[PDB]
Design a protein around this ligand. Sequence first.
Ligand SMILES: Cc1cc2nc3c(=O)[nH]c(=O)nc-3n(C[C@H](O)[C@H](O)[C@H](O)COP(=O)(O)OP(=O)(O)OC[C@H]3O[C@@H](n4cnc5c(N)ncnc54)[C@H](O)[C@@H]3O)c2cc1C
Ligand SMILES: Cc1cc2nc3c(=O)[nH]c(=O)nc-3n(C[C@H](O)[C@H](O)[C@H](O)COP(=O)(O)OP(=O)(O)OC[C@H]3O[C@@H](n4cnc5c(N)ncnc54)[C@H](O)[C@@H]3O)c2cc1C
Ligand SMILES: CCCCCCCCCCCCO[C@@H]1O[C@H](CO)[C@@H](O[C@H]2O[C@H](CO)[C@@H](O)[C@H](O)[C@H]2O)[C@H](O)[C@H]1O
Ligand SMILES: CCCCCCCCCCCCO[C@@H]1O[C@H](CO)[C@@H](O[C@H]2O[C@H](CO)[C@@H](O)[C@H](O)[C@H]2O)[C@H](O)[C@H]1O
Ligand SMILES: CCCCCCCCCCC1=C(C)C(=O)C(OC)=C(OC)C1=O
Ligand SMILES: CCCCCCCCCCC1=C(C)C(=O)C(OC)=C(OC)C1=O
Ligand SMILES: [S]
Ligand SMILES: [S]
Ligand SMILES: [S]
Ligand SMILES: [S]
Lengths: 421, 421
Amino acid sequence: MRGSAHVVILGAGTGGMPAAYEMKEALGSGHEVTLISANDYFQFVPSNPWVGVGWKERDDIAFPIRHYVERKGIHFIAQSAEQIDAEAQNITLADGNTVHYDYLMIATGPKLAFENVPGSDPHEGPVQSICTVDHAERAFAEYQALLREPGPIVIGAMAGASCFGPAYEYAMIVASDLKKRGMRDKIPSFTFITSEPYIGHLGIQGVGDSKGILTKGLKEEGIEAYTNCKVTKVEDNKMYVTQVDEKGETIKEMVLPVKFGMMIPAFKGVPAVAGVEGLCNPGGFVLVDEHQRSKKYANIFAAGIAIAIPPVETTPVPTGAPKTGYMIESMVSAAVHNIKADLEGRKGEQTMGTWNAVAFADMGDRGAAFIALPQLKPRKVDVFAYGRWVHLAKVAFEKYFIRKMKMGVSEPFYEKVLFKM
Amino acid sequence: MRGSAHVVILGAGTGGMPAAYEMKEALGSGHEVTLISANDYFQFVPSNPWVGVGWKERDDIAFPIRHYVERKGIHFIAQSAEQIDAEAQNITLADGNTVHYDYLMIATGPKLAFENVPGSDPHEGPVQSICTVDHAERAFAEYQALLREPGPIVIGAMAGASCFGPAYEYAMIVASDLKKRGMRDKIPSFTFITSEPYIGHLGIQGVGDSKGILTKGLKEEGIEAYTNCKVTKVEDNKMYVTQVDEKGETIKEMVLPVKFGMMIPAFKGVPAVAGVEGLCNPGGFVLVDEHQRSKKYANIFAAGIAIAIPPVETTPVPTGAPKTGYMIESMVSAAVHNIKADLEGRKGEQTMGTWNAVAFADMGDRGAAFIALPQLKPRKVDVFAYGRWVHLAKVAFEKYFIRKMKMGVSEPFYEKVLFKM
Ligand SMILES: Cc1cc2nc3c(=O)[nH]c(=O)nc-3n(C[C@H](O)[C@H](O)[C@H](O)COP(=O)(O)OP(=O)(O)OC[C@H]3O[C@@H](n4cnc5c(N)ncnc54)[C@H](O)[C@@H]3O)c2cc1C
Ligand SMILES: Cc1cc2nc3c(=O)[nH]c(=O)nc-3n(C[C@H](O)[C@H](O)[C@H](O)COP(=O)(O)OP(=O)(O)OC[C@H]3O[C@@H](n4cnc5c(N)ncnc54)[C@H](O)[C@@H]3O)c2cc1C
Ligand SMILES: CCCCCCCCCCCCO[C@@H]1O[C@H](CO)[C@@H](O[C@H]2O[C@H](CO)[C@@H](O)[C@H](O)[C@H]2O)[C@H](O)[C@H]1O
Ligand SMILES: CCCCCCCCCCCCO[C@@H]1O[C@H](CO)[C@@H](O[C@H]2O[C@H](CO)[C@@H](O)[C@H](O)[C@H]2O)[C@H](O)[C@H]1O
Ligand SMILES: CCCCCCCCCCC1=C(C)C(=O)C(OC)=C(OC)C1=O
Ligand SMILES: CCCCCCCCCCC1=C(C)C(=O)C(OC)=C(OC)C1=O
Ligand SMILES: [S]
Ligand SMILES: [S]
Ligand SMILES: [S]
Ligand SMILES: [S]
């Protein structure tokens, strides 16, 4: 309302949860902040692969949101938004109730586009997913069914995927867990299928010696790897795969039996956001400027996986570049700053800064990680790391981020200054 | 003097040059800042290996100091200090003139301890050095003599060395340059000799896969490598090397003929500083507290290679851990802050922060670099990088640091925030 603007944050994930706290800290008691989310709990997404192999449980990586945001004066609605009317500035919830906003910050993450590959939905066949804790639990249940009745394994990433690290991580920890259980020798075949033009491309044209290291890692585990692949369908417990050459021409088709499978799907924008006229590209991603502001609606901002970022290359099989946590938090920080600036008679000038990708993977006792910036080469930083210390750093960061999601954030967010003293 | 304290910075190197500018910026026109240095020019030390193979010249990496510091109100004395009387607070210069100080910041870098190995002084025999531009020029002259009359090459690091990267870099670029000149096949033997307990230890117990990468790099260049070595003498154009086992017992002695040689020497404190009673350890390094303040004299501070840092391990052949640029600048920044604090009735609380080591090496088209922190394992960051981008980053940083040494510094110093936007 006038003089007391209502800011709604849609989606309580890696971007949206911090966005809610930061928005309320920034605006104070004179304004209303409402966080709306499909789930009543927060989950630490990067730990889902471990849930998928039974190395972690839901309770380790997830917690109920309400009390933590409410104690900060933030309203919480645990309902999915089904429609957004950008003209009237009304959000229609799954229960049919309506929420009006003065500013909207979209942080809705990805729609997991299983529809791209008929039969690939985790509920339709043997190809599972570890992108959410619900799905990771389902993946682990199927993994146990595999242990009871061993059969072919296929892990990888679909055409159009932008999130490749977790596929490699999952393959490695499944292989590891099999060995632990003395079951590895009972698997007839273990295959890695990816849309990447080469192993370790990771949607970022490689980082450090990711190609050499991941290539050798898969080989060492007896995992046969295929690149430039797209899955045309999953049917009768078989994955139908087409492999192309540099020019997109078929060099082979394969039919792979699958007892246990996990393929990272392509991401699209969620339906309620994609459905807003003029807001998004054909993929459903919000078209925003450098200030995280929608190009169509001046009072809609967006951050996280939900925003559109232009491609920098065109791979033989479509692939996308990942949108990772540090860049996401930079988007959130900028959006919050610029909304506040708007509420104070200014055009905020803050941007997300330089494009970058960062990621951790934990194989158990040791981890891998990378940092790449900016997007195109030659880069200013292009590094891949491996070792026990990376495992320890992942453990530490998870513990930290979860505590911060409970205690609240406000500051820029980062402890780079704390560990450098 | 009273109400107008005189601060003297001794040594105009990586630490001292910035220290002079930062001190004057911090104190302003009410105080006097004098920079005293043995040479009338600044040199960018990390580029010396390239001067040593003729890939760079003195004029590329060095420039006269006077005008740049004087235009900032800093007094410049291009004389070596020969004696320091800490009681009277008087510095005796090489010309016999005396300079009084109220505060002294020692930034005198290393004494190159060739005396540890009889015959190893660059002027005494074929074993040269690339630690200074004077010496690197001499190394290149001898390298040309090698080209005229090919013979055995021996490159490496002496017992007690703490600076290992440049030995590997130099070996690699000499091998590279030989190939360029079609002379590589004319070298009867090319040997790498190091006090490190293993290749790629680097005085920091390894970083990333430094061991594997440097091991393979030397092998690829046909360079035979020996670890756990100390040179007992250089004589009649032969290097007498003793190799020990884990327990320091001789497993062999070797006598290596040398036509062209380069061994990084051990570092000690410079004589004028080491000669100050109670100031230093037996090695000549200033014993300081966390605030960079001498433990003996409250008005003497120290930064850079000149300070004592306790060892964290005891290798079969003595080795030391490197003191590198980012940590050095942190020492400088803290010293300046705490001297100013003293001049304003306070004990400055600023410290150099977390121990870390960083380094670049440039092989021509591609570079290597590492970051390790803190000193003991498991680390919070332990990374090794290689590629064209590292070459480009080294070129950029050199260009930047040299310009900053001409234009002046004041700020914390760093552009991490500039390239992240
Ligand atoms: C398996 C996996 C591993 C990853 N590993 C890393 C890593 O190591 N490092 C890294 O930096 N990044 C990693 N990422 C990438 C990225 O950081 C995460 O995907 C991150 O969670 C994305 O944040 P987000 O805020 O954009 O979306 P999300 O965290 O997915 O949050 C979206 C939120 O919006 C909600 N929502 C969706 N639709 C609606 C609706 N219509 N109405 C209301 N709410 C809705 C969702 O329930 C969810 O709470 C990983 C990603 C995955 C999937
Ligand atoms: C070959 C080489 C390569 C290196 N590579 C890297 C790298 O890649 N990355 C990195 O971060 N670090 C690197 N270092 C390590 C370190 O950063 C440098 O040695 C750095 O120059 C040390 O800074 P300093 O200020 O302590 O000493 P210096 O830079 O050596 O400065 C000491 C100054 O004191 C003067 N001085 C000495 N005695 C007296 C006296 N009695 N009276 C007056 N003045 C005196 C000297 O002339 C000199 O100007 C490298 C070192 C060397 C030798
Ligand atoms: C972060 C997301 C992107 C990637 C996700 C998943 C990656 C899976 C990791 C597979 C790699 C396993 O293979 C592993 O790699 C490194 C090689 O560089 C080796 O380790 C080697 O380098 C490391 C440091 O980096 C040294 O500490 C070690 O002594 C050395 O042998 C391991 O001996 C090898 O077993
Ligand atoms: C910084 C100071 C400390 C070290 C100083 C001097 C180091 C000398 C460098 C010798 C290494 C040369 O060997 C080189 O190493 C890397 C392997 O990791 C290889 O490069 C490999 O990893 C890089 C990324 O890191 C990839 O871009 C490349 O595609 C891959 O092949 C090169 O193919 C090999 O030729
Ligand atoms: C320098 C080499 C590795 C050490 C990096 C330490 C800190 C970076 C952690 C990466 C990370 C960031 C930044 C991050 O913002 C984030 O989102 C919350 C993650 O999880 C999804 C991350 O894993
Ligand atoms: C993250 C991987 C590598 C990129 C690092 C970029 C900036 C760091 C440069 C290293 C360096 C620092 C910090 C430094 O302070 C310094 O002294 C002036 C150097 O020269 C001696 C350096 O080479
Ligand atoms: S998923
Ligand atoms: S990734
Ligand atoms: S030297
Ligand atoms: S080094």
